[PDB]
Swiss-Prot record:
Record's keyword terms, sorted: Chloroplast, FAD, Flavoprotein, Lyase, Plastid, Transit peptide
Phylogenetic placement of the source organism: Eukaryota, Viridiplantae, Chlorophyta, core chlorophytes, Trebouxiophyceae
Cofactor(s), by name: FAD
The name this protein goes by in its record: Fatty acid photodecarboxylase, chloroplastic
Organism: Chlorella variabilis (Green alga)
Biotech utility: May be used in light-driven, bio-based production of hydrocarbons. The oleaginous yeast Yarrowia lipolytica expressing FAP from Chlorella variabilis under blue light conditions produces odd-numbered alkanes and alkenes, which could be used as drop-in biofuel.
Length: 571
């Protein structure tokens, strides 16, 4: 009905992080008709704009509310896996931390044309940074906004740095500078513009909505790619939920469908389109279009656990929870005034503004990320405690002052899968994160050694000054066996999720897309989102997705090629 009689050069499945970048770049010269189909609503919520309102976005109508299959290895629990559902996708609901990982993460992909030297200029092209000018590792002029965090905690932020130094960690002045080793303690930069969330709807899509050649439809749930050698024709979707008419957006000749539904929903939709392992498609009577073993395999997510400690009575009031709420759960006037005048103070924080990367055991690259939060978790599940914090408003109760360190296996060895639990394209996917399944027990060992490292930091004189014991995991949890059980019972997502449509070299049989991001076995179909990441980089995955989308757009528009290897000579 909104697509009746129209033909599109590009159809983007999803209106999230990658899709916003692509919609901007592919509509720029005016020559191409671009359609965006997003299942969620428009990006208008105040809870998206204010960073500290991330607490309110978990388990909300702006989230997919996805739960994993029962995980036998995690005390038989379903794990919540947050995912944004609106224009800007997870960039609209994330913690805003700006991380690229290390040069070695991209070299470890081993994919032709996607070395660290190849991807660096695409990170730089996306970027405008308030604290780093143009240089080898930073750009100025690109649509993203990055800045140093605008919340300062007078006592706890430098206490964390001093404690990390007391345990023998060195400072890292810029976690995105590839001329330094990745390990160390330091500030985490944020995807914010003077304390306002700088999501990719705000930075890339919203500014170009006036373009006549760009059509964005919200409340548009894609059901499958229409495929006719298999050739993408366009995409089926409903604007009225499960009961709605199935509409079809049609490609113009030479048009492509670009999958941008993310690492959960892209492999899910491909399987619904007949692209995936033939056994999984036959199970639900889906005709096999491209028998592609890797679709929904290689799910990589960074699992997390935490330690938390209360401050001494004399330091009551020094935590970010005290800067946001008063003793009755009322949002503090100082926080509101600082946010609106100046774009500073506790509402500019998603909780962590600094942390560390750490080698627990002599690895080539850090296996552990540490997020320092100058507030105390009341649950060993950090995501649960954020939901508690949002619900705490106006309850007439005092949130106890303290600190938290979240421990993340940032380069995990475990993998999971995404598949189908039914033939209905409106049903949730069959989601298995696979945390702690790697054969050596490396991910469990990382998080166990993480807890020991967080304990050493909390015991150090610089932080010890403020603290009065330990809440989580607490006094009862000391032996390796007690720590491992705490981790199995409390492990939660740090919200990465990559690799389910993995890019690979010619000859890599686990590949779903080639180095041109083309889906094997289908013409005119590409994936441009976190699905394609071959091996997860250390740190949060949003900046890498924008880099991939920026480079994909340049390839599609003819401004760049990927893979510059000299042809072997004629003999
Ligand atoms: C809670 C949370 C915290 C995070 N913290 C950080 C962090 O601090 N820093 C950072 O860099 N990264 C962070 N990340 C990760 C980062 O946000 C993601 O890796 C990145 O945004 C993914 O981009 P994408 O384009 O692959 O997918 P998304 O941005 O998730 O976009 C996919 C889009 O597809 C839509 N969609 C799904 N199915 C359909 C359908 N059938 N039809 C139509 N549309 C559909 C979704 O609604 C969504 O809008 C976080 C993630 C979350 C969820
Ligand atoms: C508990 C989690 C934090 C909640 C934050 C909500 C703040 C509500 C107080 C009133 C906000 C007034 C300022 C309005 C700003 C709206 C967003 C923006 O335009 O940047
Ligand atoms: C915005 C302020 C919130 C204050 C909450 C109190 C402190 C709790 C810290 C929880 C520790 C782990 C952090 C969980 C982070 C959830 C979001 C994310 O995954 O980045």
């Amino acid at each position: 009905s909104p697509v009746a009689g129209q033909k599109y050069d590009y159809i983007l499945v999803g209106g999230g992080t990658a899709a916003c970048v692509l919609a901007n770049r592919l509509s720029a010269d005016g020559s191409k008709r671009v359609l965006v189909l997003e299942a969620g609503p428009d990006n208008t919520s105040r809870d998206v704009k204010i960073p500290a309102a991330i607490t309110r976005l978990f388990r909300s109508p702006l989230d997919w509310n996805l739960f994993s299959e029962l995980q036998e290895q995690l005390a038989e629990r379903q794990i919540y896996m947050a995912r944004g559902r609106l224009l800007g996708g997870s960039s609209a609901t994330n913690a805003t931390l700006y991380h690229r990982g290390a040069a070695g993460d991209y070299d470890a992909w081993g994919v032709e044309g996607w070395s660290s030297e190849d991807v660096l200029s695409w990170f730089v092209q996306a970027e405008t940074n308030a604290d780093f000018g143009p240089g080898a590792y930073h750009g100025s002029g690109g649509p993203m906004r990055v800045e140093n965090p605008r919340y300062t905690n007078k006592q706890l932020h430098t206490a964390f740095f001093k404690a990390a130094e007391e345990v023998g960690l060195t400072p890292n002045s810029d976690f995105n500078d590839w001329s330094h080793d990745h390990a160390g303690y330091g500030t985490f930069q944020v995807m914010q513009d003077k304390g306002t969330r700088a999501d990719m709807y705000r930075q890339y899509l919203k500014p170009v909505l006036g373009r006549r050649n760009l059509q964005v439809l919200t409340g548009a749930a894609v059901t499958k790619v229409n495929i006719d050698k298999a050739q993408a024709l366009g995409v089926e979707f409903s604007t009225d939920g499960p009961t709605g008419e199935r509409l079809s957006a049609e490609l113009a000749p030479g048009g492509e469908v670009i999958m941008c539904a993310g690492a959960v929903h892209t492999p899910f939709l491909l399987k619904h389109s007949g692209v995936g392992p033939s056994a999984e498609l036959k199970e639900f009577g889906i005709p096999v279009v491209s028998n592609l073993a890797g679709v929904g395999q290689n799910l990589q997510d960074q699992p997390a656990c935490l330690t938390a400690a209360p401050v001494k009575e004399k330091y009551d009031g020094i935590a970010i929870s005290d800067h946001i709420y008063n003793e009755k759960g009322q949002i503090r006037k100082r926080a509101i005034a600082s946010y609106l005048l100046g774009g500073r103070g506790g509402l500019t924080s998603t909780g962590c503004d600094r942390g560390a990367f750490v080698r627990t055991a002599g690895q080539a690259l850090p296996d552990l990320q540490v997020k320092f939060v100058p507030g105390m978790a009341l649950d060993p599940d950090g995501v649960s405690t954020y939901v508690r914090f949002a619900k705490f408003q106006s309850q007439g109760l005092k949130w106890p002052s303290g600190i938290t360190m979240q421990l993340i296996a940032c380069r995990p060895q475990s993998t999971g899968s995404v598949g189908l639990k039914s033939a209905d394209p409106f049903a949730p996917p069959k989601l298995s994160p696979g945390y702690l399944t790697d054969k050596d027990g490396a991910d469990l060992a990382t998080l166990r050694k993480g807890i020991h490292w967080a304990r050493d930091v909390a015991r150090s004189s610089a932080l010890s000054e403020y603290l009065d014991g330990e809440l989580f995991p607490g006094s009862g949890v000391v032996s390796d066996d007690q720590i491992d059980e705490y981790i199995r019972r409390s492990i939660h997502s740090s919200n990465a999720i990559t690799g389910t449509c993995k890019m690979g070299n010619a000859g890599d049989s686990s590949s779903v897309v080639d180095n041109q991001l083309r889906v094997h076995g289908v013409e005119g179909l590409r994936v441009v989102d976190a699905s394609v990441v071959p091996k997860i980089p250390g740190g949060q995955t949003g900046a890498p997705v924008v880099m991939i989308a920026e480079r994909a757009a340049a390839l599609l528009t003819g401004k760049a090629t990927i893979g510059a290897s000299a042809a072997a000579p004629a003999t």
